[PDB]
Amino acid sequence: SEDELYRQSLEIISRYLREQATGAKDTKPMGRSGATSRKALETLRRVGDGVQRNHETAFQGMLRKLDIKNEDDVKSLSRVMIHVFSDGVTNWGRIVTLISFGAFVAKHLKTINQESCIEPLAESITDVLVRTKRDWLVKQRGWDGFVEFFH
Ligand SMILES: CCc1sc2ncnc(O[C@H](Cc3ccccc3)C(=O)O)c2c1-c1cc(N2CCN(C)CC2)c(O)c(Cl)c1C
């Protein structure tokens, strides 16, 4: 508890991944900073959908390599995301790439009837994001900066 950046990040990443996998928009209400989370989510729908479409084949090739079939395969993904994601280059571009690839994997977990792994995948992406990029994100004003960068 007492970590708004983490809680907001999970709300937004979790909601994007569920709605990308199922095509249904979450109606359950947003917590503190609702206005910023809704706008964050709206921006992911536009920018994250763009990355998935623009780079479908790069995304498909990686999903094919990672050979995700189950809960264990999702747990191995975290360490891959750390190696690729935490390497000293931080920008909203690569952050959207991370979250877009997550939604792409989430869609695949729906298609293979492994939708019980989507909430853990979201947690693992959130943990990689906030654990490894905390000071950059606070400098960029967190999700308010995200929305302002892409509006
Ligand atoms: C777990 C998969 C993930 S998490 C994540 N998070 C942020 N950015 C990523 O990648 C972009 C490039 C990028 C790739 C595809 C589309 C847009 C940008 C980047 O690192 O700066 C990735 C990738 C990622 C990384 C790669 N690589 C890995 C090895 N490097 C040397 C070459 C690019 C890749 O081919 C693909 Cl398809 C992805 C999805």
Residue 93 CA to residue 85 CA, distance in Å, equals: 12
Contacting residues for 143 by C-beta, under 8 A, at least 6 apart: 8, 9, 12, 33, 36, 37, 40
Resolution of the coordinates in A?
Answer: 2.2
- Among 95, 151, 147, 84, residue whose Cα is nearest residue 126: 95
- Among 85, 83, 117, residue whose Cα is nearest residue 101: 85
Q: Which of 97, 127, 133 has the most ligand 1 atoms within 8 A of CB, as the residue to mutate?
A: 97
Residue 123 CA to residue 21 CA, distance in Å, equals: 15
Report how far ligand 1's centroid is from the alpha carbon of 150 (Å). Answer: 20
- Name the amino acid, one letter, at 107: K
User: Which residues form ligand 1's pocket by a CB distance below 6 Å?
Assistant: 55, 58-59, 62, 80-81, 84-85, 94, 97-98, 101
State which approach was used to obtain the coordinates.
Answer: X-ray
With beta carbons less than 8 A apart as the criterion, state whether 5 and 142 touch.
yes
Q: Can you state the angle between helices 71-85 and 92-111, rounded to 10 degrees?
A: 170
Yes or no: domain 1-150 corresponds to CATH 1.10.437.10: yes
Output the CA angle 103-95-24, nearest 5 degrees.
Answer: 25
